[PDB]
C-alpha cells in the first residue's frame, strides 16, 4: 500500500528477525564508529588496528564461523548484510573485514587441523589477532616456494598488495610444494615475529586509502610441521577463499552504491538551478531512477544467492554473476553520481569521489567473471 523509495521491494520484510538484528547492529557500529573516522582516515591513510577488536567483539569477524571456534555462527545472508553496512561507510573498512573472515578464518576452518583451528580461530574472531592472505605476487603460476627441511618447511618468495599485512599477527601464505610426483600449491600459517618474514607497509595509494596494505617478504622463513594446512592442495585452496570473499564483496559494493545514490539524491534536493531545484530536471530524474533500479535488482540477486548458499543449492558460477554485477553496477552508479556534482572536493557530496576511487580498485581485484559464465553456458573455454 505505501511506497518505500529507499527500499522498493521491502527487502527488510524478506529477512529473518536474527538477520535484521545482525544488520541493525552492523549499521549502528559502522555509522557510530567508522563514519566519524573515514574522511580523515582516507585523506591521510591513517592506520587504525583498534578497528579489528571493535568488530570482533560484536561478532563481525568470521560471521559464518561456528560458535565452537569463537565465531557467531551466522548464515551467509547475515554475512552479506554486515559487508553492506560496513562498505556503506567505506570499502577499505569492508576489505579489512572480508580478509579476516573469508581470506583468513575460512581457509583455517575448512582446511586446517583441529590443532590449527583451536589455536587461531578464537583470537581471529575477537580481533585480538589480525590476519592476512598472501596469494598475489609482484595463481597456477606463482613463484613463492616451500622446501621440505628438518622439522618443517623453508619459504622464500614475495607477496604484494596484501591487505592488513603490516599489522597482521597471522599470515595465511600460499606457496608451491613439490612432494611425491606433484608440484602443488599449499597453504601455510605464519606468525608475526617469525625469522625471515617482514611486512613493509605500502603508502601513497589511490583507492582504499582507509585500509592498510603491504607486502609479505619471505627469506628462507621457517614454518613448523604443524603450520601447513593438511586438507587442501592446489587451486581449490585459494579458490574456496576467493569465492567466499566475492560473495561478501557482491553485497558490500551495493552498500557503497546506495551511499552514492543517497548522496546524489540529497544533493539534487538541496541544489537549485534556473530557479527550480535540480530535482525538477527530467534527466536528473532518469539518473535517480536508474540508480534505484540497479541497486534494487542487485539486492534481490545477492539475497537469493545467500539463501541458496545457506541451503547448499548454490553453484560457484552464481557468485560470478553477482560479483560482476554488483561491482560493475556500483562503479557505474558512483560515476553517474560523480558526473552530477559541479564542485571540486570541498563539500560533503565529494564523499562520492572517495567511494568512486575505492570501487575503481575493487573492480580490478581481465573480466574473468564474464569468461567463467561464458564457459558455463557454452562448454568452451576462452580464458
Ligand atoms: C570553471 N570551473 C567550474 C567549476 N569547477 C569545479 C572548476 C574547478 C577548477 C579547478 N579546481 C577550475 C575551473 C572550474
Numbering used by the authors: 4 to 141, 147 to 373, 377 to 394
Quote the study's own text.
Glutaryl-CoA dehydrogenase (GCDH) is an acyl-CoA dehydro­genase (ACDH) which catalyzes an intermediate step in the metabolic breakdown of lysine and tryptophan. Unlike other flavoproteins within this family, GCDH (EC 1.3.99.7) performs α,β-dehydrogenation as well as decarboxylation of its sub­strate glutaryl-CoA to yield the product crotonyl-CoA. Transfer of electrons from the glutaryl-CoA precursor to the electron-transfer flavoprotein is mediated by the cofactor flavin adenine dinucleotide (FAD) in both prokaryotic and eukaryotic electron-transport chains. Like other ACDHs, GCDH from B. pseudomallei (BpGCDH) exists as a homotetramer with tetrahedral symmetry and possesses an overall fold similar to that of the human enzyme.
Additional structures of BpGCDH resulting from this effort were obtained by soaking apo BpGCDH crystals in drops containing our Fragments of Life (FOL) ligand collection prior to data collection. All fragments identified by screening which bind BpGCDH occupy the pockets that bind the glutaryl and flavin moieties of the substrate and cofactor, respectively. In three of the four ligand-bound complexes fragment molecules occupy the binding site for the terminal glutamate of the glutaryl-coenzyme A substrate. The crystallographic water coordinated to the Arg97 side chain in the apo structure of BpGCDH remains in place when FOL544 is bound, but is displaced by FOL239 and FOL6421. In all three of these cases the Tyr373 side chain is rotated approximately 90° from its position in both the apo BpGCDH structure and the human ternary complex. This new position appears to facilitate ligand binding by providing a parallel aromatic surface that aligns with the heteroaromatic rings of all three fragments. However, a conserved backbone deviation is observed between the structure of apo BpGCDH and those of all four fragment-bound complexes in this same region. In all four fragment-bound structures Thr376 and His377 are flipped out of the α-helix observed in the apo state, partially occupying the binding pocket for the adenosine moiety of FAD. This perturbation results in a new orientation of the catalytic YEG motif. Thus, the binding of small metabolite-like ligands induces a conformation in apo crystals of BpGCDH that partially fills the FAD-binding site with protein residues.
